[PDB]
Amino acid sequence: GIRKLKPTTPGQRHKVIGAFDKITASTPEKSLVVGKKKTGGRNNTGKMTMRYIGGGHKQKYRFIDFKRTKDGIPATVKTIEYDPNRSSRIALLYYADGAKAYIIAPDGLEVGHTVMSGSEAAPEVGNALPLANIPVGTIIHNIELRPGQGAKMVRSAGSFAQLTSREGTYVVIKMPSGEVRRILSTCKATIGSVGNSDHALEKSGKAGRSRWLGRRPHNRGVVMNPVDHPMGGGEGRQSGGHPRSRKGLYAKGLKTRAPKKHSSKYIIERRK
């Protein structure tokens, strides 16, 4: 859900934030968190390689189990928690073996439920199965690209993918982007869609919230000088010509995916 702020101030007139109605705990698990350092977009030589990054609230990293290799060990869902590092919520799991882990919280997973991973697991929401064992037509998320490497594909809040058909060693999956592509049937996926689908309805309301989230102001190229940007210069306002970056890379329709990439053999239909 979402909470719309009343317009007591101009900086709150257009502000919509989440209702936090799924969170059941406020403190993270101590053994699964660690303090995280920030980069200002600076690489190991100290040079700013990525702009518009800096400041923001201090954050701690949560260890998410994207691999889920504890096959056949049932786990109990303990809490649903806020994670500052991703748009979705996370879930705390207690294994009957006595381990603890964090997983991406799927839509519909409630505190007190049971989850399992591996081939013998029932295809219920929250369970992790090899794609060879998932019934065709199931809504899935957290899709592995290579077997054993961990989920990479469908992870953002509200996002989901679909298993459309299977063709032997490969299954066919439709992506959030609308791409249709082939995935090895020994790769793993989790049943259900990622929760917190109302994350897209939130509005910051003011510049201060972007500063809290750790973004820095972005300057348009047409209001610079020619020495700084190809689109800068002129007396008064000017359009800047064909849109391009500081290095002259066209910004309208020029494709940048490598034309000889091997993975294009597994991509049936493309969509960006």
Partner RNA sequence: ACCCUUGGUCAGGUUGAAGGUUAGGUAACACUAACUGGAGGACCGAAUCGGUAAGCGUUGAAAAGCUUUCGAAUGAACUG
Partner RNA sequence: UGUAGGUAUAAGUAACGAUAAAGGGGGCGAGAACCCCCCUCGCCGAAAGACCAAGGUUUCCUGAUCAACGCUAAUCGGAUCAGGGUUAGUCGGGGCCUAAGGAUAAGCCGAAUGGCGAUCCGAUGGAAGAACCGGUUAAUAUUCCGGUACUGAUACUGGUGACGGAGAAGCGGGGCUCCCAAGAAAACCCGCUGUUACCCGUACCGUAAACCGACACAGGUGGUUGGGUUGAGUAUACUAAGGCGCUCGAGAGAUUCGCGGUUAAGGAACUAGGCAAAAUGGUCCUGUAACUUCGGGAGAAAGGACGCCUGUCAGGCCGCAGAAACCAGGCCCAGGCGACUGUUUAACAAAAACACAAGGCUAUGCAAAAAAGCAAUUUGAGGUAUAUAGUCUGACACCUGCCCGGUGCUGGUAAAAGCCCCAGUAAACGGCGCUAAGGUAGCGAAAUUCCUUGUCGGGUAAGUUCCGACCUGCACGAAUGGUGUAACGAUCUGGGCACUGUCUC
Partner RNA sequence: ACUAUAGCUUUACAUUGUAUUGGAUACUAACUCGCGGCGAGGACAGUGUAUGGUGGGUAGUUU
Partner RNA sequence: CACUAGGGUAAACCCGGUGACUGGGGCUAAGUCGUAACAAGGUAGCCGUACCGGAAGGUGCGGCUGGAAA
Query: Of 70, 98, 189, 64, nearest to 139 (Cα)?
Result: 189
Can you tell me the distance from the alpha carbon of 103 to that of 16, in angstroms, rounded to the nearest whole number?
A: 27
241 binds, among RNA, K ion, Mg ion, none (CB under 5 to 8 A by kind): RNA
The single residue among 220, 242, 246, 270 that binds K ion, judged by CB under 5 A, is 220
Question: Does residue 236 belong to the site contacting Mg ion (CB under 5 A)?
Answer: yes
96 in Cβ contact with 85 (< 8 Å): no
Secondary structure, 3-state, 69-111: CCCCCCEEEEEEECCCCCCCCEEEEEECCCCEEEEECECCCCC
Site for RNA in 185-204 (CB under 7 A): 186, 196-200, 202-204
- Calculate ∠ Cα 65-108-155, nearest 5°: 40
Between residues 218 and 255, which has the closer beta carbon with respect to K ion?
218
Can you tell me the distance from the alpha carbon of 144 to that of 132, in angstroms, rounded to the nearest whole number?
A: 13
Between residues 35 and 236, which has the closer beta carbon with respect to Mg ion?
236
174 binds, among K ion, RNA, Mg ion, none (CB under 5 to 8 A by kind): none
4 binds, among K ion, Mg ion, RNA, none (CB under 5 to 8 A by kind): none
* φ/ψ of residue 74, rounded to 5: -70, 150
Choose one: 58-66, 82-90, 203-211, 224-232; the region binding K ion (CB under 5 A): 224-232
Site for RNA in 29-68 (CB under 7 A): 30-31, 33-61, 64, 67
Choose one: 31-39, 116-124, 168-176, 217-225; the region binding K ion (CB under 5 A): 217-225
